[PDB]
Amino acid sequence: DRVLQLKLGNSAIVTQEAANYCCAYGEWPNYLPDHEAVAIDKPTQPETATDRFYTLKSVKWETESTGWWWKLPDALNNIGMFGQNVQHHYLYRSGFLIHVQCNATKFHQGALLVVAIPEHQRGAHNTTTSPGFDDIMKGEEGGTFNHPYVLDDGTSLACATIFPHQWINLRTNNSATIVLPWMNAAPMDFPLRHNQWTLAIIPVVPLGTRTVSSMVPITVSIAPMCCEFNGLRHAI
């Protein structure tokens, strides 16, 4: 459909069968203004070093695949210059550029709701205990959905399109683009211990085809836009 080019830093993503992007809540990502700032130390602003489209590990799409999610910044907490600035700084303020490539043939049937959840306080099924570090901070590989139908937090996937969302309905869309600004009540927060966003690829229509069932990867490439880093400390 719409050919889209996203070029930041040394990285560039071209897509030929994408829709219009999902610039979240009508606002571009931006650096912290002076009236908005809290930390009095000067932000790092690495720009092109950390604007790179960090391509994560692609997850395989099958018929029984419930869903996947990568928490931001936890997905990029260890990857590249953004990850190094995450360990080296206690405060950050970065928006994200979500690009999800799901390359499939024209005979492939499937629809991935790519939904960016602000503060996905996830739930745990049949237990009142809060999810631990091993159930929340899965990092670069990213957690699989135990119950994506309820968005794994007691809410509904059926109402998840109020969130910044795209679809990879494989009829006329192979790639999705959601442009998130900074999303927090604080201007800046700890990247190692608070996920301001998460990206959830949920196959609301699973992979169904009657040709040779090939491996369809869901590749997540996140470019941290307008990334700012405050409180230069040691590598946490």
Place this chain on the structure above:
Amino acid sequence: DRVLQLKLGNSAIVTQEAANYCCAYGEWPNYLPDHEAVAIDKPTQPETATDRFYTLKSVKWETESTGWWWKLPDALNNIGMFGQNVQHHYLYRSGFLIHVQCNATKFHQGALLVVAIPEHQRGAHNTTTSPGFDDIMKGEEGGTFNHPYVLDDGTSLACATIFPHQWINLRTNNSATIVLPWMNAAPMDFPLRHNQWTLAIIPVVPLGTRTVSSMVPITVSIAPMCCEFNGLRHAI
């Protein structure tokens, strides 16, 4: 007395011994204005197809005849193009043109209060049960009054002239004319399950004469003025 001609659509009623009409509450019937409308779909406005004076079945007038009533739109719910638009639409807004012809000789004594009751929530004598479909929606033939003296709802016939009313006092009036606009708190309502009007022919003075007792018909002809139909569905 007053010669009156009512011409709508293909239908025309001439009367030579009528009074002035009873344009109800000082307002002509009108189509729904734009500031007044609720349904966003375009109304049908059949006009001359459904402005026709639908002549109902005449009821016989005798000495012991308590009274008759036809609920609007229930009397015309199945008759003609208005009836077809009633089954084919979920919403309507039509005023009515009541013309009641009671042709009697100059030696005939009788007075029919033709009274148009807005929302005749009828009563049932000696039972607390609400009247069913077979006691309310009698349709084209129209229900006979069980107790017209109390207007069959616990109210009084004696105060029924606050309603849009005419008389067929057979001294100098043979035909009655009551021009009703749309009468509902809603701008539009379901014609099959709500009677916005009813017309009640009540012989407050019964038929009394000392000549040859001929059959005196009470003929009700209702012309739906400014009829509007919204929500085109199947024939309910």
Place this chain on the structure above:
Amino acid sequence: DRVLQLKLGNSAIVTQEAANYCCAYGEWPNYLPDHEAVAIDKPTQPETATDRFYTLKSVKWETESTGWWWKLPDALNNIGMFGQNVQHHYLYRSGFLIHVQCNATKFHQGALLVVAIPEHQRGAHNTTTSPGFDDIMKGEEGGTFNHPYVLDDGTSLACATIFPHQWINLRTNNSATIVLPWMNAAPMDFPLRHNQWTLAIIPVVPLGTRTVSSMVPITVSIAPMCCEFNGLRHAI
């Protein structure tokens, strides 16, 4: 190819692989002008009640399917508010909006000449007798072509593109649109006993494919544009 939206009344048809429409003989449908009119009674003009895209019964397309035809107004003589106005009026003047949806896959081969014949005086093979009611007025279901190669009237299908015509060549056309105005020597005529138009779906190239042979429906949706109804009588 061309995305087309046709919205009339409560009905709307969207098509994504259609061509430009076939507004017949360069004229939009129109209501009867005052200098053009014959009947002195006021027309009904139901507009949005009878502008609805009346979707007919879809006919199955096979390899041996000769062709189908629906006579206008005979196809819509009993369907919806247009059908009710057809029985309730002796005179009508309505143009039509033909939309024929033949949804087929991109690997399906076939070409339907959708040809609107004005006064298809049909023939009967090997008999000099005129076709009766059971050979002409088939109504909503619509007659199948005995000999579509000669257009079932002694003429030729090969010259039928002088008529208002479209094609559903299934390469790059899945839906056809022919916009017919009123087509009669009279300004108005009896809808029950004269077919001013007919629509003929003729598979000049039949359904041929080497994939799984699925049921391909030919769905005819006719929206009576600028429909006018004169001579309000009983339901004939």
Place this chain on the structure above:
Amino acid sequence: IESIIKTATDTVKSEINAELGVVPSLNAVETGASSNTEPEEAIQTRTVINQHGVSETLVENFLSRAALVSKRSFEYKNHTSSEARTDKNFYKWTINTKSFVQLRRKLELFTYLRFDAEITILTTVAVGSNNSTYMGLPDLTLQAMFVPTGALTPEKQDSFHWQSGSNASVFFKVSDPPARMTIPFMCINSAYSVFYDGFAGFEKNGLYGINPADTIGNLCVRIVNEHQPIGFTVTVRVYMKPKHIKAWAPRPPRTLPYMSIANANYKGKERAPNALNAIIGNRESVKTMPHDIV
């Protein structure tokens, strides 16, 4: 038309008006009500300036009287121990205009009524007859929650539907002024159809006269305080004052006694007045004067 009259209209001086060809008192009832006024005929009136009251008999002032709509006396004890149908320290009342015949007849003079309901809840505590000793009247905080019609109503005193996060509730003490609140004009139509010649649902088995649009809601009234060892008959009297009245299509007043809340079913008294065959108490004859001065 265009009459913004604030008092009763004054009459003008009338002389002998014996004019041929015109007669005011000769009218047609077969048109409507007659226009023959006092100085026109039948009396030789004098010019009296009429300064009489009109604001009291305004339809606003006619219907802005706080009359009773829900007098419910429910017991306040361990209802959870052994009760079956009775009101377990709480009652859900379907807010109807028809429970008490005074205000029912007052609003049933009109077909349509746009008003906001100033609901004032006056709740009284009495000691139940089982205890047979006073021991003081407790100060009871009560919650009246306006639930929409057909929505989820509580089933217990502590039913966890009393949080009132979205439902509007009023908390009020018995040792306090009565709870004054204003339920809005919340009908989906532009007036409350006090009479309904129709059925609620599209099925034929619906109830006649119960339009859920004109059903105001459900006042669920409970004791917020937990149970006392002494049972108390809490008589909660909801009086509804209809305010900002706009009235339409005036009707005959209800003459026969009301039988049911739901419908307008009728059965008069066993003899006149207000009987089915005779609304007025009968005289001896047409020529007989009751309470004639002797």
Place this chain on the structure above:
Amino acid sequence: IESIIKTATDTVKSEINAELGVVPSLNAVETGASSNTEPEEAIQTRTVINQHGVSETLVENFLSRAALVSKRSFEYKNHTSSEARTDKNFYKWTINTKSFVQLRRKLELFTYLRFDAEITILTTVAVGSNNSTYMGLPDLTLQAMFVPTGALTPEKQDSFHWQSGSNASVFFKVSDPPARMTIPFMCINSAYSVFYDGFAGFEKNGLYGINPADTIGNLCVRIVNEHQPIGFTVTVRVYMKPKHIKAWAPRPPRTLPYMSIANANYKGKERAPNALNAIIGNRESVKTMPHDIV
């Protein structure tokens, strides 16, 4: 953008819009929500001026309903004599938005919420079941002290932390109007994150979802009066009305029943509706209509 609309928007008159090359109803859900309006396609609308209500469904008016956040029924007796864990004529309540599912679900429609909490405390006295006799409801003065989160909370009724020299406390009687106070928007961030995808401390053993910034505080509610010889179940109901609402990033409503105050853990009912595998109550088929008109 730049819409300061105060009512529902009116529709314009729509004619036959069969135009080739453009189609409004054909949209892309893979971009966002569709912009195909009513007069654009699929209906031939009429010009109806829409004067419908918008102020009631304002997010302010949506969330400015005083719903229950802390219903605690604590006994009022000699707790110092022999009690172990129960509330010794006082309770420290961690002020959470999550105790009652109505207002919890209402505030959990939004990720971020800047509001001042109009805390209204309605306290009711009932006689406990051990006494089994009324003997009057006493007028009890109660102190509700807002302690910051993590600060020193009292341990007794007379704990000498009730002086409230710096902590803000409200003294209120049960024979009085309920205690209306406004807790400020006191979060260290610019909104209350109603959901928190993170942990409180920099250690890995922190609790998930408990940001102490969005924890409002601790309402320590006590009886200022010393103990009576009769024990009384004091049911204190703190209703929080969120006011000056500014809301951010709207969310799916919570469909499954809540299990815990701390987290958003989920377990649906044993059958639909609101079940884990089926949020909606199941129909017979795709082609089967429930509550179809017959």
Place this chain on the structure above:
Amino acid sequence: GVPTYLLPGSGQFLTTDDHSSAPVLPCFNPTPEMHIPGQVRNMLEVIQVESMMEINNTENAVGMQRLKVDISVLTDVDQLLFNIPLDIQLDGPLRNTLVGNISRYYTHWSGSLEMTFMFCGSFMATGKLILCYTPPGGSCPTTRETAMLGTHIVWDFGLQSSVTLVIPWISGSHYRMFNNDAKSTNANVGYVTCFMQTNLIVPSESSNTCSLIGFVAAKDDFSLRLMRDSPDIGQLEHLHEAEAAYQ
């Protein structure tokens, strides 16, 4: 402001009080007004409309026969056709009207009472009716010569077939009370006594027992004060579907 002392009428629940009270939905916009026909903003709009008087008021008259009075061909002149007591606030033929039932929601009333009689006989039924409202102070006139001294009107049927006897407002006080006694000076109103004037003549093939429907309305000089509960309705017991609107 801050110094506020409670009045003796503070904390009470007056029924007729007009103070503004609290909303329950803090931002409820009601549905906008449509022009429903017949907007009623005062009771006088309902008051001046005619409504049938129960003139017959007799035990043999059942229902329909009560709202009309059967006037017959009399063989002799100067008989009382009927006499109507004009107690619009007390039980009588004027009670079951718009003006009677609505004025019984008030204790004090004032204004002229129009009373329109429509002759519901045949066209060929001819006769003159003399309708005489007598001011209070004496007995009801059973003879015409005692009746025509009051407010009398003579009515030939003709083509118009209806007359309006306007009962004037002659009283010592500005208003008339209800007071539950029809003998009182401030409660008795007068007597509308209708008599034959020149007898009712019908043909032999028309009905001899002709019928007359009378109505009382008022004019714009009517007025009502001291609103009270009407005694027309009455609740001795909680009706059906009450305690089923609670369950």
Place this chain on the structure above:
Amino acid sequence: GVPTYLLPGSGQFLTTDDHSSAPVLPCFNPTPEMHIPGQVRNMLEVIQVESMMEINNTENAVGMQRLKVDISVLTDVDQLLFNIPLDIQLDGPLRNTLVGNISRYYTHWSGSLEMTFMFCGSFMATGKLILCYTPPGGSCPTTRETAMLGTHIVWDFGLQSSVTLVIPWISGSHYRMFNNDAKSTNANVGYVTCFMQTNLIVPSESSNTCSLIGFVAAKDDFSLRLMRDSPDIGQLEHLHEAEAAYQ
């Protein structure tokens, strides 16, 4: 000023009242606003956003299969693909949406309901769907010719792969009630019945059981009054960490 009488609605705790109450910190300056994205000042901003309808609604459909409807290659024309009840305030496929769950915080609702269906099949999967919202008053149409008389739209999949059937606002009243009865005139809304138009044609190497995701949003003509507690959530028992937020 000094003479003050208490109203009947004085001393009560209304839930929806808006009177200003006392501060607890007498000089608390809150932290200043930052521009958090997506400022929500009205529910209509959330209302007009699409949200998946639970169209399948069937016991074999577990979770993910409920939010889509499996439309298959039918061997014959004029079958009902699915029919959706439009009770946005009652339990149904429109309940688990933004518009349904948020409108269940209200009793009265109004406005057009947009319903966008996205064809989540293959690119080579072709077919026309006819989606017909039927106004209330009759039964749900199980046949297409009874369905196309209502608000019907014909949708070819094509490149856009989604359609918007805008359900118009045709009702007698200005608003529709909740009222807990789906049969009522002021509560029944209509039926969105989707049918095959020209059948769904897929290749043999594409999946025959194609899938469709439907959504309901509204337009800016939507409106909500009479706020109530939503029945979607419910507390029968005090949850975990309650009585541990007190200890």
Place this chain on the structure above:
Amino acid sequence: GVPTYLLPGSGQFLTTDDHSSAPVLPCFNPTPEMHIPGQVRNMLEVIQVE
């Protein structure tokens, strides 16, 4: 004025409330201010000192 309804927060004793209360001496003039050194009008004056 005369129509006054009590708020839910009426009759309570808030600690941080700022409403003006009654004097006890009806004409008490306090001793006038002298310039005592170090007038402290905010806590930040004490805060920024080491």
Place this chain on the structure above:
Amino acid sequence: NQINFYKDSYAASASKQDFSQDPSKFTEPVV
């Protein structure tokens, strides 16, 4: 004379000032 201090117009005092009346709707509904 109005002490409407609440933010809703429906919460105001009972407006007993609508002195405009048209009896010709119900008395003379002719011509």
Place this chain on the structure above:
Amino acid sequence: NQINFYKDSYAASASKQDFSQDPSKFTEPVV
């Protein structure tokens, strides 16, 4: 219609007057 007599702006009435709304943040978050 506001009886905010206290010295804090957060103590005022519930400001149900923020009629400005932007649905294009959430409906049309594109281009």
